[PDB]
Structures are given as C-alpha cells and as structure tokens.
Amino acid sequence: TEFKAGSAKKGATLFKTRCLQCHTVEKGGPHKVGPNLHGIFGRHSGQAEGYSYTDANIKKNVLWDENNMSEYLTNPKKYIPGTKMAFGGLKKEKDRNDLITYLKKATE
Ligand SMILES: O=S(=O)(O)c1cc2c(O)c(c1)Cc1cc(S(=O)(=O)O)cc(c1O)Cc1cc(S(=O)(=O)O)cc(c1O)Cc1cc(S(=O)(=O)O)cc(c1O)C2
Ligand code: HEM
C-alpha cells in the first residue's frame, strides 16, 4: 500500500463509527476489547502495556507505519492471520488515508 496524507477530520469520524467500539487513542486511555493505540506508530505490534494479545499479533512483530497500517486495515486477518480483531476492513483507499491521517495525530 501507498499511504497519502488525507483528512484527519474525516478520519476522526471514521474512527468514531468504525474503531471506537474497541479502541481508545489518548495517552493512558483504557484498553477495551482491543488495546489502547497511543504510540502505535513507530512501535512494534503486540506491545501496548497491559493488554493481552494473540500470539499472531505479537509474533507478526511489525514496526507499524502508514503503509503497513493501510494494508492491515484493508483486511486485518489477511495481514495478520489468527488475529482476534473482528473488523472486516476499510475497502476504500480514501477512507484508509483519512483514518490513518487521523490516527497519526490522535495517537501521538
Ligand atoms: O475534505 S477532504 O480533504 O477529505 C477531500 C479530499 C478530496 C476530495 O475529492 C474531497 C474531499 C471530496 C470528496 C469527499 C469524500 S468524503 O470523505 O466521503 O467526504 C468522498 C469523495 C470526495 O470526492 C469521493 C471519493 C471517494 C474515494 S474512495 O473512498 O477511495 O472510493 C476516492 C476519491 C474520492 O474523491 C478520490 C480522492 C482521494 C483522495 S486521497 O486522500 O489521496 O485518498 C483525496 C481526494 C480524492 O478526491 C481529494
Ligand atoms: C478501523 C478501525 C480500527 C482501527 C484503526 C484498529 C486498529 C488496530 C491496530 C493498529 C491494532 C494492532 C495493535 C498493536 O499491534 O498493538 C489492532 C488490534 C486489535 N483490534 Fe483493532 N482497529 C479497528 C477496529 C477494531 C474493532 C471494531 C475491534 C473490535 C470489534 C477491534 C479489536 C481489536 C483487537 C481485539 C486487537 C488485538 C488483536 C489481536 O491480539 O490479535 N479493532 N487494532
């Protein structure tokens, strides 16, 4: 995938409707079904303090960046088979760019 900076404003709404059910973004925010995502970019997968991940998410050991995040969010279980993230994917490229643009800001 080839991430292109988009609209964090539209990304924020996508996060609310598609991700917030299972994730927080703020520093020190609580885990839910999924891990809090603060600091995700530039850290390896499966490392949020205090959260119990699948073996798949840990052993994937990917250094998250905007491009591999775009691939992941297209189809999570294809990128990380054995994941327990029950999310089908954002099939639209502009949605992925906008969501990732938001996520970069929100998880800083
Ligand atoms: O306000 S924005 O900065 O987000 C904006 C950027 C672009 C835009 O063309 C528009 C808004 C108008 C517009 C908005 C939306 S919305 O996010 O749903 O509100 C959707 C579209 C649109 O033209 C339609 C559209 C959809 C898709 S798809 O989801 O991938 O199928 C792609 C595009 C669309 O125009 C092409 C496109 C991509 C991108 S990208 O950020 O490079 O992916 C920016 C802009 C684009 O027109 C350039
Ligand atoms: C597009 C919206 C979403 C985004 C941006 C997102 C983002 C992420 C990211 C980046 C990871 C990897 C975290 C890491 O490696 O530390 C992850 C894992 C996870 N997510 Fe999501 N997610 C979304 C939707 C969801 C939804 C809707 C759910 C719940 C139904 C969910 C539940 C989980 C779970 C359980 C994990 C850990 C998976 C595992 O251990 O295998 N996510 N998510």
Say how far apart CA 78 and CA 76 lie, in whole Å.
5
Distance of CA 63 to the CA centre of its chain: 12
The residue written with tokens 């990304």 in the block is 11
User: Could you tell me how many residues make up the chain?
Assistant: 108
Say how far apart CA 78 and CA 65 lie, in whole Å.
17
Say how far apart CA 30 and CA 1 lie, in whole Å.
30
The residue written with tokens 């929100």 in the block is 106
Q: ∠ CA(24), CA(20), CA(87), 5° rounding?
A: 115
Task: Give, using CA atoms, the residue closest to atom 29 of ligand 2.
Answer: 22
Residue type, 47: Q
CATH class of the 1-108 domain in this structure: mainly alpha
Residue type, 4: K
Q: Does 6 sit in the ligand 2 pocket, CB within 6 Å?
A: no
User: Which positions ≥6 away from 86 have C-beta within 8 Å?
Assistant: none
User: If 0-12 CB within 10 Å is exposed, 13-18 middle and 19+ buried, where does residue 31 land?
Assistant: middle
Q: Does 66 sit in the ligand 1 pocket, CB within 6 Å?
A: no
8: three-class secondary structure by DSSP: helix
| Structural tokens at position 51 | 């959260």
The experimental technique behind this entry is X-ray
The residue written with tokens 């964090």 in the block is 8
Say how far apart CA 66 and CA 52 lie, in whole Å.
24
Say how far apart CA 86 and CA 29 lie, in whole Å.
21
Q: Does 73 sit in the ligand 2 pocket, CB within 6 Å?
A: yes
Resolution (A): 1.4
What region does 39 belong to: left with phi over 0, alpha with psi -120 to 50, or beta? left
Closest of 31, 23, 68 to residue 51, by C-alpha: 31
